[PDB]
C-alpha cells in the first residue's frame, strides 16, 4: 500500500527502525553528492558544506567559530536525530509502606537449619495479608529507633553464616560451569567486593533501587541491584529506539522483582520491571519464554524441557484414537522362556536319548561346562539356507539359569507313556510341558495389566471431558 501502512508493516513485523548512522566526512560527502548526477557542478546547499568539510582545517574553523572546544565537537555527532521526546515524569500511587520479611525460599536446598527457628521466621510470611489505611498512617511513631523487626533479625543471622561458609564453594563452581563473565552471571574474581548480597536474599515482591550499568539491544538493561547477580529488565528489538531516550547509563532507578530463577539453567536469574521510571507504554515486543542454557551435561532433550517448563517437541498426530486398539498380550519374559526351554531340550535329548555321550546323567546337580558371562550375546552365526548367509538365532543359555530337575523327571514320565501306548494305541496326549504352561500363564498376567489400563481409560476419558482437562498431553 502507500508509504504510511507499508512503512508501518516494516516496523511492527520486520523490526525496522531508522537507527542513525555515524558517517565519516568522506562517506558523508558521498551520500549528499550522488543525488545531483554523475559529474555535475555542485550548487546544492548542505552539499558544498560536505565537500568543504573534507579538509580537517576547515572542520577546526567550523568548530572554533561555534565554540565547544575539542572533545565535544566529536561527541555532538552521536546525538539522536529525529523526534526528540519530551523528558520523563514519574508519578506515584501513594506512600511506599513496606514490610520486612524473609524470602520464602529459605533455607537453600541442602542447607540445614533448626526448624524451630524457621517456624518463628515463617510467621512473618503469614502476616503479609493485612492491609493498611491512611488512617493509622498519620499515626507515624517517628522515633528513629525501637523497630520491632525480630524475625528478620533471626533470618539475617542465619543468612550471614550461610554467606561466610558457602562463599568459597559457590565461587569455585561458577569458575567450573561458566567460562566467561556476562551480565547475569556470578560476580567472581576481582569484581567480587565483600558484602554483596547473595541470591537467597532476593524474592519476588521486593522493590529495589540500583544503577543502570549495561544496555543490551537484544536482551535489555542490566541494573546493579546490589547482589552478586545483576538484574535484567527484558527489552528487545526496536523498542530501544524510544526507550534509549529515557534510560541512560548510570541512572539510579527503582525496580521490583518479578521472578528469580536458577542461575545454572536460566541465563539471567533476576527479572525486574522499571518502577521509576515507567516505560510500560513503550514496550511492545516481549519474551515468550525466559532464556536458558543448553549445556553438554544435558544428554536427554526431554529432561531439559521439564527443567525450564517448556512445551515438548510436537509429534505428528497418528490419527488413531488410542482408546479402541488391540490389547497387548505378549510378555517380556516369554522371549527368555523360549531360550530357556530350548536349552533344556537341547541338553536333555543329548543326555538321555544318548546316555553314553556324557557317561553319567547327574542332572540333579549338573554344573556348567563352559565359562559364561552375562554381557555378551552376538549370536547371529550367518546361517545358510543353500542360497546365501542370513542371520539366525543360537544364543547362550548357560545352565546357571537352567533348572534341569523339573524337566528331568517329567520327560521320563512322558517317555513311559509313549512306550506303553504302542500296544493298545491310545492317543498320546502330550502337547504342553512345564515351560509351555508358563508361556501361557505369563501371557495371561500381561493380559491383566493391559486389561485394566484400557479399562481405566474409559473412566479417565469421561472425567476429562466432563470438566475440560486435556486428553492428549500438550504438544
Amino acid at each position: 500500500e502507500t508509504e504510511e501502512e507499508a512503512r508501518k508493516r516494516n516496523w511492527v513485523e520486520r523490526g525496522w527502525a531508522p537507527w542513525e548512522e555515524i558517517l565519516s566526512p568522506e562517506a558523508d560527502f558521498a551520500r549528499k553528492s550522488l543525488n545531483e548526477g554523475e559529474e555535475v557542478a555542485l550548487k546544492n546547499p548542505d552539499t558544498i558544506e560536505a565537500f568543504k568539510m573534507l579538509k580537517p582545517s576547515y572542520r577546526k574553523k567550523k568548530m572554533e567559530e561555534m565554540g565547544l572546544t575539542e572533545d565535544e565537537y566529536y561527541a555532538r555527532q552521536f546525538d539522536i536525530k529525529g523526534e526528540i521526546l519530551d523528558p520523563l515524569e514519574t508519578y506515584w500511587d501513594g506512600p511506599l509502606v513496606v514490610r520486612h520479611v524473609a524470602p520464602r525460599d529459605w533455607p537453600p536446598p541442602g542447607w540445614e537449619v533448626d526448624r524451630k527457628e524457621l517456624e518463628f521466621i515463617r510467621e512473618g510470611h503469614k502476616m503479609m495479608a493485612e492491609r493498611v489505611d491512611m488512617k493509622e498512617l498519620d499515626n507515624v511513631i517517628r522515633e528513629k529507633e525501637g523497630m520491632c523487626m525480630d524475625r528478620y533479625k533471626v533470618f539475617l543471622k542465619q543468612y550471614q553464616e550461610w554467606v561466610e561458609f558457602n562463599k568459597d564453594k559457590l565461587e569455585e563452581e561458577s569458575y567450573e560451569h561458566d567460562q566467561d563473565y556476562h551480565p547475569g552471571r556470578r560476580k567472581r574474581g576481582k569484581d567480587y567486593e565483600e558484602g554483596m548480597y547473595e541470591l537467597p536474599f532476593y524474592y519476588p515482591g521486593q522493590i529495589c533501587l540500583g544503577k543502570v550499568t549495561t544496555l543490551h539491544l537484544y536482551q535489555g538493561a542490566f541494573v546493579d541491584v546490589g547482589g552478586v547477580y545483576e538484574g535484567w529488565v527484558p527489552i528487545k528489538g526496536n523498542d530501544w529506539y524510544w526507550i534509549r531516550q529515557h534510560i541512560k547509563v548510570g541512572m539510579h532507578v527503582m525496580v521490583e522483582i518479578l521472578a528469580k530463577r536458577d542461575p545454572y539453567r536460566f541465563r539471567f536469574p533476576l527479572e525486574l520491571r522499571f518502577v521509576d521510571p515507567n516505560i510500560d507504554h513503550l514496550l511492545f515486543q516481549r519474551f515468550e519464554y525466559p532464556p536458558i542454557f543448553h549445556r553438554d551435561e544435558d544428554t536427554n532433550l526431554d529432561e531439559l524441557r521439564r527443567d525450564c517448563r517448556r512445551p515438548p517437541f510436537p509429534r505428528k498426530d497418528p490419527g488413531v484414537k488410542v482408546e479402541e486398539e488391540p490389547l497387548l498380550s505378549d510378555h517380556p519374559y516369554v522371549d527368555k522362556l523360549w531360550q530357556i526351554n530350548v536349552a533344556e531340550q537341547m541338553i536333555l535329548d543329548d543326555m538321555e536319548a544318548n546316555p553314553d555321550k556324557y557317561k553319567g546323567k547327574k542332572l540333579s546337580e549338573l554344573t556348567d561346562e563352559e565359562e559364561f558371562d552375562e554381557e555378551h550375546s552376538v549370536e547371529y552365526t550367518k546361517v545358510q539356507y543353500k542360497k546365501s548367509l542370513l542371520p539366525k538365532t543360537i544364543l547362550k543359555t548357560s545352565v546357571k539359569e537352567l533348572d534341569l530337575e523339573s524337566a528331568f523327571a517329567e520327560r521320563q514320565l512322558h517317555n513311559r507313556l509313549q512306550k506303553e501306548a504302542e500296544e493298545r494305541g491310545e492317543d498320546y496326549k502330550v502337547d504342553k510341558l512345564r515351560r509351555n504352561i508358563e508361556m501361557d500363564e505369563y501371557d495371561f498376567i500381561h493380559w491383566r495389566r493391559s486389561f485394566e489400563e484400557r479399562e481405566a481409560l474409559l473412566r479417565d476419558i469421561s472425567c476429562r471431558q466432563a470438566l475440560g482437562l486435556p486428553l492428549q498431553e500438550p504438544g
Binding site: 563452581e173 526431554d302 527368555k336 498431553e473
Partner: protein, 104 residues
C-alpha cells in the same frame, strides 16, 4: 550443586519404605499381581499407576534418558500419565498395581 533427582523431575511421587498403616487405608491387598524375570518392558502409560514392588528391582529408564532411577521392595511408585519409560527388569520381580483415573 545437587541435580534435581530424576525421581521427582517427572513428578513421580515415591514413598520409600511404606508403613503398614498406610496400606490398609489404601487397600493394596486387593491389587492385581504382576511378575517377571530378566526383561525389558517399554511402556507408554495412559493412566496413573500405583505400584507396590514386593521383591526385586526396576531400574526404570525414561525414554531418551542416559540415566536411571532404581526401586526395590517396599516402594509406592506413582508412574504418571503420558509417561514413556523403559523398565529394565533383572532377576525375579513381583508387584501390585492399581491403575487410577482422575480422582483418588
Amino acid at each position: 550443586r545437587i541435580e534435581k533427582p530424576l525421581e521427582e523431575l517427572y513428578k513421580i511421587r515415591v514413598e520409600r519404605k511404606v508403613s503398614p498403616e498406610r496400606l490398609n487405608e489404601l487397600g493394596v491387598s486387593r491389587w492385581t499381581t504382576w511378575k517377571t524375570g530378566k526383561c525389558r518392558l517399554p511402556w507408554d502409560w495412559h493412566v496413573d499407576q500405583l505400584v507396590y514392588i514386593e521383591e526385586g528391582e526396576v531400574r526404570v529408564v525414561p525414554e531418551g534418558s542416559k540415566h536411571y532411577m532404581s526401586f526395590k521392595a517396599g516402594d509406592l511408585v506413582r508412574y504418571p500419565k503420558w509417561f514413556e519409560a523403559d523398565l529394565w527388569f533383572n532377576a525375579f520381580y513381583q508387584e501390585r498395581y492399581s491403575f487410577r483415573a482422575y480422582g483418588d
